[PDB]
């Protein structure tokens, strides 16, 4: 269970960058720690000893040490950049390949929204995490440890100061984090409530306004407002006390250096230069310890990203083609269910159970039922997007679990209620079913779909521009565009939902009539909840609560099939 996949394989091929980044960074750190030792030498061995060479020579030396340290840095950043960016690219790619293999069963485990955030944000956090590991995670702890090492080497005894300075700071960081985390969580809660009241008051403005109840929403917003003022004022009152207290401890620490160091120079144990470097070291230790405080905070969140990304990588696709799957060079379009029991989530009740039906090639079958009857699972089962728990689904009397998926889906067109187009042109979209389709063929399909005249009125016609997701076309325009997109594919089975956009104008009837001329050599399921729509079909599959209720014509079904009678009563 779980999975043995690991995101340390995405950094592995750029390991050289992963070693030069932190190496180069130690050169910066050593050069940064060189500086105060060289200063102390200018005064304890240069100034105090009257020689200009010393001062001049170590002075020239300090410049060189600064130019060198600068390379180490820029170096570290160059390499860490490559290491991280390549890691990100490779991770992202495998993430995307994973999702392109997912079934509906996989996608429902995560959510489509969460899946999006894992392949976007979560990728960039790990990219940063890797950057972070290769630079300040090397920089800060070496300055801290090194500064202590230097301090101790300068005067072991004075270093006792650090024992009194570091524990109170660490404890300050613990206490802040422990007492801070609930309050900042409280902010996000109040922030959200502020967003809840503004959103509902926008989306429902027509209701609150018509109900003469706007002041109640002012009253409502006040509470969310006053709460956001408090949760923020309280969280940050800590922060605004945190920082100044840190500065003091650092300061008061330097007081401890001068004072304690004062007795040591009187006792001929420390030169004044050493006291001067000790201050410069004291501050490198403290401010680096603060950076370490920050690194820890990012690690824990970034870690959550590592888990989500890993769940996706470790997920096995629910629909697998068999090793010796049957090729389907053609399909006649006969379709049967044999005792199909189906359910999207193992928690809930069965969406279908004991569903038996068969459809001869070329039939125009209306699949009629109310919401939740299971009529909408058809679109998912016939092409193999899900597999039944029990029973089998067949196309051309073949279990769809036996045939190649490319061949099977290549012959079946499904037009769901909610349509999705992709960036590019209307023509590119319409050609999704066949690249080699001629414009005449596309125009034919669009004409049947009753969308050709709309396309042709646009300034750039068919080469007109489709924006992301198809978000710039209306609902009924996307729907027909999706219908045309299906027809160009030349499907041998055609599954259409919602009849058409729920109570579409009379032109809905034209598309139906127009399909009837085309469905010669196409088995066509039209999943409607409308009696009139089901009347255009050769035969009606009536579904009630998961079990097939009846399967025939209106006159038959109006006799026996009780659900059909109940439906017909509501519509007439």
């Amino acid at each position: 269970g779980g999975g043995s996949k690991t995101l340390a394989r995405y950094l592995k091929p750029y390991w050289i960058f992963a070693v030069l980044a932190p190496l180069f960074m130690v050169v910066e750190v050593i050069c940064d720690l060189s500086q105060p030792t060289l200063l102390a030498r200018i005064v304890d061995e240069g100034i105090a000893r009257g020689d200009f060479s010393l001062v001049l020579k170590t002075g020239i030396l300090m410049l060189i040490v600064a130019l060198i340290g600068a390379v180490g840095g820029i170096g570290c950043t160059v390499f860490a950049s490559y290491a991280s960016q390549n890691f990100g690219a490779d991770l992202r790619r495998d993430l995307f390949r994973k999702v392109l293999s997912f079934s509906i069963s996989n996608v429902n485990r995560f959510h489509t929204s969460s899946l999006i955030t894992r392949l976007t944000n979560d990728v960039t956090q790990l990219q940063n995490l890797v950057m972070m590991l290769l630079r300040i995670v090397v920089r800060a702890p070496l300055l801290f440890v090194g500064g202590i090492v230097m301090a101790v080497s300068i005067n072991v005894k004075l270093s006792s100061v650090l024992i009194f300075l570091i524990p109170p700071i660490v404890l300050l960081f613990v206490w802040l984090t422990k007492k801070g985390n609930p309050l900042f969580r409280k902010i996000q809660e109040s922030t959200d409530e502020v967003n809840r009241v503004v959103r509902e008051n926008l989306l429902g403005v027509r209701v609150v306004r018509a109900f003469r109840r706007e002041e109640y929403e002012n009253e409502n917003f006040r509470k969310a407002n006053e709460s956001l003022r408090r949760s923020i004022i309280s969280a940050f009152s800590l922060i605004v006390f945190a920082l100044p207290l840190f500065i003091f401890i650092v300061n008061m620490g330097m007081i401890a250096v001068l004072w304690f160091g004062g007795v040591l120079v009187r006792n001929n144990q420390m030169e004044i230069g050493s006291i001067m470097a000790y201050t410069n070291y004291l501050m490198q230790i403290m401010f680096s310890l603060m950076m370490i405080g920050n690194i820890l905070n990012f690690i824990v969140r970034a870690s959550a990203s590592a888990k989500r990304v890993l769940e996706v990588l470790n997920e096995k696709p629910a629909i697998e083609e068999a090793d010796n799957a049957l090729a389907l060079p053609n399909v006649e379009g006969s379709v049967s269910f044999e005792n199909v029991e189906f359910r999207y989530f193992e928690n809930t009740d069965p969406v279908l159970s004991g569903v038996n039906f068969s459809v001869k090639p070329g039939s125009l079958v209306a699949v009629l039922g109310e919401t939740g009857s299971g009529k909408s699972t058809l679109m998912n089962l016939i092409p193999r997007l899900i597999d039944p728990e029990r029973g089998r689904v067949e196309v051309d009397e073949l279990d769809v679990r036996t045939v190649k998926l490319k061949d099977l889906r290549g012959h079946i067109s499904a037009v769901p209620q909610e349509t999705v187009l992709f960036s590019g042109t209307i023509k590119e979209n319409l050609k999704w079913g066949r690249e080699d389709a001629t414009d005449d063929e596309i125009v034919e399909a669009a004409k049947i779909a009753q969308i050709h005249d709309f396309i042709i009125s646009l300034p750039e016609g068919y080469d007109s521009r489709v924006e992301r997701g198809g978000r710039n076309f209306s609902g009924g325009q996307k729907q027909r565009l999706s219908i045309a997109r299906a027809l160009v594919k030349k499907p041998k089975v055609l599954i259409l939902d919602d009849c058409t956009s729920s109570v579409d104008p009379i032109t809905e009837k034209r598309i139906l009539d127009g399909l009837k001329r085309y469905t010669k050599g196409c088995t066509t399921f039209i999943i409607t909840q409308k009696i009139p729509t089901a009347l255009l079909a050769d035969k009606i599959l009536v579904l009630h609560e998961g079990k097939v209720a009846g399967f025939g014509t209106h006159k038959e079904l109006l006799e026996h099939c009780k659900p059909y009678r109940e439906i017909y009563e509501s519509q007439f």
Binding site: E28, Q35, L39, I42, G46, I47, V55, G59, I60, M62, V65, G69, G73, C76, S84, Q85, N86, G88, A89, R92, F96, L100, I104, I116, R135, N195, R196, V198, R206, V207, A210, R212, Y216, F221, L228, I233, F236, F241, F248, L258, G262, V265, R266, I272, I275, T279, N280, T371, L385, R409, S413, F422, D498, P505, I506, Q529, P532, I567, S570, F572
Partner: protein, 583 residues
Amino acid sequence: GPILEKPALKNPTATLRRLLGYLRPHTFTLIMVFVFVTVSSILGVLSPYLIGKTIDVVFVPRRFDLLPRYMLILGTIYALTSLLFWLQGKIMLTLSQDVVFRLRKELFEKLQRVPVGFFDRTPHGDIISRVINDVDNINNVLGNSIIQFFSGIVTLAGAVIMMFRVNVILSLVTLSIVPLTVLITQIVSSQTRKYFYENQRVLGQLNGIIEEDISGLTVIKLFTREEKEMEKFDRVNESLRKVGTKAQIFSGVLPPLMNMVNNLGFALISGFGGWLALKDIITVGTIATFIGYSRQFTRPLNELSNQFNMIQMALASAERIFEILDLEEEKDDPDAVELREVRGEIEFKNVWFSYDKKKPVLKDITFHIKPGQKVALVGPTGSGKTTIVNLLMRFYDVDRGQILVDGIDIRKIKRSSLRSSIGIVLQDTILFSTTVKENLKYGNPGATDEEIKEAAKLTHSDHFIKHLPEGYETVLTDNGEDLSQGQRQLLAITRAFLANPKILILDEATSNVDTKTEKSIQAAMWKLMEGKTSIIIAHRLNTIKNADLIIVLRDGEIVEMGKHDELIQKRGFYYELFTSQYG
């Protein structure tokens, strides 16, 4: 991060004064904070000077009897500097917080009064995003950026004044890094900007491909597009690999560079400083002091620039917010009238309307609905039958012609009294995130917990209501997401009942409704519509057959008008619109 372009503020000083009047009631408190930063910044440039003096008065002449007096002066100086960092932050925290707390009342109240059109025109997600961001932008600048800028200025000027009055040669030496900083900072920030945006471009593209391919995954599979989509991803991904590297490099090298400039400052001060010391021109403490200022001319300069741009940006944000607060609000007429108790007759006189004023939506619409009459509005998508609802509620005003309830023109009726007499149930119903009881009570504040039941009993809603988990006090999370759509429409019908309107405008969907509720809702409509004038955007056969008047619409023009049997007998457009449906 890197700013795109400088904000085109339409005379900032004018909106600056306006903004400077929000925090006006706390002037004294704002002056008190401003002297704090001054004395907290000045005290902070004194510290490295005293350390040099301490080095010069106690350590060098071996006068360690003077050490406690110096350590006490520093120690208290330190104590005061950190005690003013708490103060001048604790005060600005609430002051700033109160300022925006107001801005949220004002913007939100502006929302209640602002015409619907503003909401109808712009995608809701964006107005909340821009406004909120504009607001934080204020908050961050009023609570932080302003004092950090000022504090930086007093600190910078302080450290410079003291440097020159200690030694001039050394001052010119350390201040020689300033040209270096500026030159480095500028050259690097120019590349950081260029590659940040080129990266953001590709990243936005790559993410688009990801968001649309995941949301439409099913369509990719049915069309066996996995390979092609993989290709489209790859070329963009490989393009991001190369650009991100450049973006991440240039955004990364400025700190080592700044730190290098720091190390160079440290060196020159130690060389020239030590050399001057050998020449008895300066003292050792003087070198210690100049070390203390040696990082005051790198990052704190950058801070100054960035804080300034943040301040500049905040003014643009203030300008947008002030324009929203300047928008015109819906108001009644001075002679607007309350609604006398009438049974509600409706008339449209040659009315014309358009949303963009370029593309006509309604034309010459004339009809007369007498009290108690059930009226059906039928027609294709674009008939404009969905626009009539808005005009009669006066969400939009007519271009030409006149609409009138009970004879009196609608534009001369109090908007308060109109929306009570006239009720409304829309196809896209809106429930709130409160309990069932609070939703039904919404139409009538003073409704008892017995009349809510009684009315819900009468519209077949009360049944499922008590069958819900928490019953009548079931908090409908995410606007009734866990409800049967029929149940939602039943609740919408029930709450429209409790507002006791004398004119009812219905639009009841049929899409994903189960037959069981369906019988109930059309029964509920009937109890709703009785004793009321009812203009129905009908979808059901039993309402158009039982309507007293049908108004067939097409292209925003009334093509036909009459009863069901007559309009079928005419065999006109209503025939086509009907027989091609229930034929």
